Amino acid sequence: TMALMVSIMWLCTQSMLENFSAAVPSHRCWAPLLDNSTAQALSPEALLAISIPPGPNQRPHQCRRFRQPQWQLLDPNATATSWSEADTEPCVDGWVYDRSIFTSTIVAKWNLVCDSHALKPMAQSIYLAGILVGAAACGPASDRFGRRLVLTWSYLQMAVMGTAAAFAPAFPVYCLFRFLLAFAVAGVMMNTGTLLMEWTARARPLVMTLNSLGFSFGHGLTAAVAYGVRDWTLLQLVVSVPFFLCFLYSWWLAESGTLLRMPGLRFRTCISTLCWFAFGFTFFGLALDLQALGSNIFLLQMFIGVVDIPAKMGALLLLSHLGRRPTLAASLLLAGLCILANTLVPHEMGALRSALAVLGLGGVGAAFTCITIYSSELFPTVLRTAVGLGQMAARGGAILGPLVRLLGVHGPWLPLLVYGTVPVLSGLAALLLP
Template identity: 75%
Template sequence: MAFSELLDRVGGLGRYQALQTVALMLPIMWLVAQTMLENFSAAVPSHRCWVSLLDNSTSQVSVLDPETLLAVSIPPGPNQGPHQCRRFRQPQWQLLDPNTTATNWSEAATEPCLDGWVYDRSTFTATIVTKWDLVCDSQALKPMAQTIYLAGMMVGASFSGPASDRFGRRLVLSWSYLQMAMSGTVAALVPTFPLYCLFRFLVACALASVMMNTSTLLMEWTSAQARVLMMTLNSLGFSLGQVLTSAVAYGVRDCSMLQLLVSAPFFLCFVYSWFAFGFTFYGLVMDLQGLGSNIFLLQVLIGVVDIPAKAGSLLLLGCLGRRPLQALSLVLSGACILANTLVPRELGALRSALAVMGLGCMGSAFTCITIYNGELFPTVLRMRAVGLGQMAARGGACLGPLVRLLSMHGPSLPLLVYGTVPVLSGLATLLLPETRNLPLPDTIQDVQNQAVKKAAHRTRGCPVLRSTQL
């Protein structure tokens, strides 16, 4: 008798499953905070070059107001505000003449920010951008840090599957909790940017393992009738994590303290652990500044919209099946993102609404894929197959932040790429088999038997012409 059949007989939705779901959902909420962290800890505040006239406490010029001193010290930037990356070599006092125009100074009269930058700290007291000056010529280091983090998720996914099959799901999950807690804590305290990237990489490796083992444990220890409910509840943990992230970041505006706060709970998860998507999503959701001005509200809206989207998928999975819902969610997500390429930037509220809707559809697709992925493969190959799927997803996710660099060639190019990928993926989903109401296969033979039964069902009732010999 297969284990899934035995579980159905003895009861696959009891006290053990309830405790297991609670114990596994709580870390998932904090796990989301680790991924969404850099929306806040790596936010880029307004900045300008440090200049002696304004920022040197021993400066003798005090009769002029700060706006006047700023005008003679910093050239205007592309947005008509103070230039963020250049300053005048010498104060341009002639600019105080009302008859003077912008042509009275040239690029040769300016220089880079040789003495550092002054940052607006009204929203965030400290971010990794202000801590290590990841602006101007170093601005590409921020998406590189995000890519390194997502590469860690890809590496973690490649090792987690084989390790879980060899040492067991629970042992690997417990180790992953400990690794996330320790690496995240060290990342909050390191003095240099390369070390920060290294320990964030280690956090991501463990994070991928937690995601994979959590979904697999819930899948394997729940009856077929309750499996969709459990996986939807697990998926809702990601939605609640979005809201939790914004709440924590709103209260803690220092990047080091924020990193420490979202890492420390995993020590607790490690203690109680015996109880126990890719390119487009991470490309958009790790750059909320590009979607709107109020990143705190956007983070909350993404989580809030995610909840009904995933709850609705619970009903649609039973009505439509896995394959149609997966395809529909991905295509709708891509359509919302592509529609944003046609909306003027002045309509910020509409652009934010379309982006949130697209991410909500992506949340529905995430719920579906966590169920679908586990049902497609037999137990003997499930973790390896899930690991390969995670590697593919994290490989795409690694490219997500880098795609934003295309905006230098055209502001709509990143959205065009982010929207096209899920549409093509959704159409490709139609090539997969349907797994609704089928038992989890234990062996490769079980998968083959299911295929044979489907083929027999399709040909049932069809007349067969036979040749008989007299």
């Protein structure tokens, strides 16, 4: 059990790595008055103000630059914002990034900025699509080639794709490498889950809670690892290297039907699929943009893990001491209300915002535990593949999760508004379960 726990722990730091590898630093247009020693100087902040027009949040524009240094806005006797927008350039000479927090990221290497800001959520969507494809293809592969052969193949693919993406020279090559890595990640996830549930199980909820707690420890692991390197290349390298060593376990150290959904329990099937879709949506939408949910990313991830562990412990305790429907409804309602308060609290209260975000990210994990336990009891053994269809719909919702972040252009509250309104409807639907 410890081996598979360490495996899923590294799986967590290989899957949620997009939080740190795709983190966006403060960026702006390349300017000859600021990035060239020939004309660099008066106060530097005044140079930044007169060389780049003010953008959103009263900060310098993330992508804009004046044609000439506008001295007309430096003197206080003249009103601000008097410049015309016709004299602006959309970073015609390149971009610059603040290396104070992160020394190198995929956003700073391939210029994932305003003109192509959709690429990072598109990258997460491609990663989740690779997850879906791997989960859909691991079935026949594991059923034909064996349960350990597919494990070894997934480990080898993970290691190869990790060491390849660590040195990706282009964005499409990196996207393909991440697609294959997500394929292998989903394959090994399904293999670990089935190997645990078939061999370790009466204690099925205990083993499931242990596996998901190892996954939660993966969050603290990825936080502690990203706090050290802060370089996406070295990060990917040191995160993908242990799989090639775990591949030594090959051969144990060298040998020492959803068609019945309509005639069956239609209500249970649709409600379970809705709850799984909601879990996937909310989790893979919130667990990939922690930079906007709090003030510090590493501390946020550490708190997320150190609250998810006891939150999951209490969720298991309440599921053992009470029915699965009331605990699931309560967890879903709590997560929804927490995310709604998180998108409703003003941005200045960063500590309270981060606390609400951690509470919601613990509540969604508790709801995942409840739906995982309830999938094995909602349907008889003849219909129990219901859990497979549920997990597939969860992956499908996790695919569309990051795509909602594209709606941030209309408003920064709308993605979080959706991520808070979805669990409310999920709980209201689960409240009707028999």
